[model samples]
Target: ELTSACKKSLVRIFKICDIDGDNLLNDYELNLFQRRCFNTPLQPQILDEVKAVIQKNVPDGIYNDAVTLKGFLFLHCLFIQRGRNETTWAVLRRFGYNDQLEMCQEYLRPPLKIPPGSSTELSHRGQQFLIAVFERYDRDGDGALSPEEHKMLFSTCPAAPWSYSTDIRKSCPINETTGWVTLHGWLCRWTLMTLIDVVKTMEYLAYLGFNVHENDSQLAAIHVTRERRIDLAKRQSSRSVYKCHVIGPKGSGKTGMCRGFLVEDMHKLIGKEFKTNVVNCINSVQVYGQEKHLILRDIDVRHALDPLQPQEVNCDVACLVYDSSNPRSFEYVARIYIKYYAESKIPVMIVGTKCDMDERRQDYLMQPSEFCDKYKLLPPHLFSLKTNKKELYTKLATMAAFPH
Candidate 1:
């Protein structure tokens, strides 16, 4: 639908291009309009060709072999009708017209200001767009994108947004069996990128047709978070993502605690294949009503004597796991907490596993309960094969959300 706003602007441009009091624009006037707007000098052959097209469509469009006002507007209408709306837009903006038939600074690059300590994520509208894009690319209805399907999805984009330069494909969670990118995994990939580099994220959104289809800028798709330190001190966080490092020694049920983040039924996870495997886990957790991504990373402290590395120590929360039955288990994480976490800003959670079976005393001067009271940390979350897993994850998620 060409509104008066567009046609009125075009009508004015047509009058300007007439160059004379005459109602029609002759070849010379058309040539000047072409040269001025497109910076391309018109060829007589192309002029005759275009005139022939307009003449065939509009009976009175041609008057004495000069293009009439009707022909000028109809010519643009034809350009738009042929799925070349951009051609019409190019002409409109080159003359003075700028919103839907619009061109302004805001449409191109809306200023997005995010603080250094803050991060960015997709807004609700942005998430909708991403999910919509994912569904479009998921051709087989497998709820994941295959390798060839992934290529076709970004074919319209200039290049892959998360390219070979990034470790994103491997870093984000993907379909376990086929190794395809699941919807959850794909969103996480963009989420991680948006958190890391919002400008790059915005640029890719523009490339992926987020702005053009929405009749808005890419700025609408991004939500910039407040500084986490401020959120922590304030005892409230509007943040949507939380990282919790699962710190424990070998055979201390660290892997069980992480894998249990995936399935509700521990019975399904009891098999031998991946029961002892150490891998990262990510799942959405509802702290209250709002959904937040709680990623659990299995970080092994090499030795009780080994110092904590910077990468291993960085997390929103540290979930220290220890076997209640194994007296030596608590010693490893206890030293890790004092050496690395005790002095840090990260909140701590002590998870006691194997409470279903007979419990043995932890060989430490202060028990888990006394140590938490001394450090002003919360008491240990008890877990077993038959115990509540979701509750523990939720508790950790809450700690991550409102860290002290």
Candidate 2:
């Protein structure tokens, strides 16, 4: 039921809520918007409740402290579909309508009067200003402004010294299909209205829906650049949070990897004891000139579902460890083990541990390559925590971070 005009206006309003210009709305900002615009802020506890709902349902991870444009729209869509209760009704009311139809009517209104202004014989500043504003609003590159674009200029700059007719469609006969006003027609139309009327028109446009066509190359380029930047920023921010699950049979140096020690240091722990179903280890490493946050979890495989619990941790990569010293460890990595990640589709790394235990004696059931080939998995990598060499781990983290 929303018009193109209203959506554009909504976009503008949402940006306003994103006061920091980060393209996101934090909890305080969102709460402020509710208090100021919605005319209601609930109890102290209610604020937390609202924040929880948005944080949990938004597209990005809950750890992200703000909501993006897509998340904002999704919040609105939830209310729109559920029924106009307290939350939604206030939003509609702020947009200058109690119902969606009234909003559409304001957007579809034709030009009611010709605007009054002269483009010729203007001050240098005024001329420059006009050109700048025109360039900003002329989104189609048709050497003119479409209705939506014309409306946005006014919406964005309500105090600009200009005028627009409520019924520009009648006075300026544009191509109905394209709905654009040529420069000559625009100047003519501009010369007929007052600054007062323009402001009123701009205010009206804010409440109505708009259908802006983004067919211009410049506009398309801007969109693509913004998206790419957002994606990169998200990756950089979450780089430190990537989790790697280390799962294998007992005495396979899984705990040693989690302790930041190498397999060579294993004998040093003869008198010491450690006990935990889950042992989380945090370490930072440089990969491709960027610091990566890695959480290596040494998980006991006493229960089949033990590894599955950390899937909720949003692991970036899974490392399946097998002892190069014990062939029986390879037997546990069967169909059930691999199928656990089948539904979630998280990438896995088959790792052969204790590579330093052998000089020439090979005691494992099958070579790492043959095991993967038999299981239709990627080739396994050899790791030695005792040697403090993590070239393979860093390579895997980089691959996980930038997976296509």
Candidate 3:
């Protein structure tokens, strides 16, 4: 049935083709419209035949040697009625119609396919487009999207599956009273979803005509990266972000490592206790010439009785944290390494936290350094609270960037 957006599009294209503004397409106007739509000229004989056929089917269809809007609409109805839908679709498409009528498969969807293990990240054009929207909406020049401005930004997508200052701020920084997001957090939000929940990612991109703005499809806006196994085999990645799960026991400086990742914006640290509970932290770092986001998910083993969930250890890289001041902390994280990642392809890093305090030996079978040596992993990284705090993060970023 020709209804809603389909019928509405007919009127719009009809209005465009009625060149003289008489609310009718005369012979000359019809010729121009026909030429533009199909890239072919309409002969006088064929024009008369089309007019005769339309007038015969619908009385009062012709308006004094011109086709009225109703008559034009009726013509397409006949075109579709007899399965000449291709002709009407071609005309609609030529006039840039991508509504419910012509683009059934494309409305709010990705025109791309991704293999199971492959992931989507923002392409160069896709990334800049977001920044463009961000800067365009960030009217205050505070370099962040306030709740007010966020409403307008959110206006494009019209509905938010998530929030700017909600659970995401637990991972990224935000303003308290302002309820805003810096470009850092804004970029992270999109990258985070573009990595995990790709559906909404393309939905947003498609809504704002990002494809048309860039003269490319939604497919070009995203990078469907290579399969995980192949990426591991190559020891290289052509992607924009790396996931590193920071696994450790409670009270083992896991939170400290995450907080340290936001060192560039130290004001976000201890400006007040983060009102929201945090689990993940992300920030950008450069790997050689390419910039990449490094995600540090603090995989909390909340208590002694709780076991780390299976498949939770799967990550681009692993950061095993043990307190240098505690004698028993090494075995737990080490057991996890052996249990999950030891036989896996994921790259691993061992870090002994609390290095500033007096160092103590773990009451375990092997020392941290000895265990790392036996497993062929890198030696333990000694991290301290009193430092520039960017070393281990960039090192982990480097490890994920070049797993070999």
By lDDT, the best candidate is: 3
What are the per-residue Cα lDDT tens digits for candidate 3 across 298-342? 776665446667557788889989888899888877788888887
Which of the predicted structures, 2 or 3, would earn the higher lDDT when compared with the native?
Answer: 3
Backbone Cα, N, C clashes tallied per candidate: 2, 30, 0
Q: Give one digit per residue, the lDDT tens place, for model 2 in 1-404.
A: 54575465567666445545456777776766676555465466765665577677764623365667765665666666677545655655554444642443433343343323211112223223344445655756676777666766556433433333333443333443465655544533332221113434333333321211111111111100111235445432233335576777666666655544222233444334454333444444578787654556666566444445544333567777776767656655543345575455567778777777672323456566776787666786776655666676575576556653
The count of backbone overlaps in candidate 1 is 2
> Residue 383: error of model 2 in Å?
2.2
Pick by TM-score: which candidate is best?
Answer: 3
Model 1 local distance difference test score = 0.72
TM values, all candidates: 0.61, 0.37, 0.68
Arranged by lDDT with the best first, the candidates are 3, 1, 2
What root-mean-square deviation over C-alphas does model 2 reach?
25.1
Off by over 4 Å in 3: 1-105, 173-180, 227-237, 265-275, 302-310
Model 1 per-residue lDDT tens digits across residues 1-404: 56676776677566445545366888887876676557788898988998999899888999987989788888887787889888787666664347454434444456887765566778888998888777766767888887777766665444677542133344455666676778987787777667656777777676455663454668889987663434336444367977788888877877766766655566555433542334356677787888888778888647778777787887778899988878888888678888888889988899888888788887888787788888887787788767546788888888878848
lDDT of 2 at 63: 32
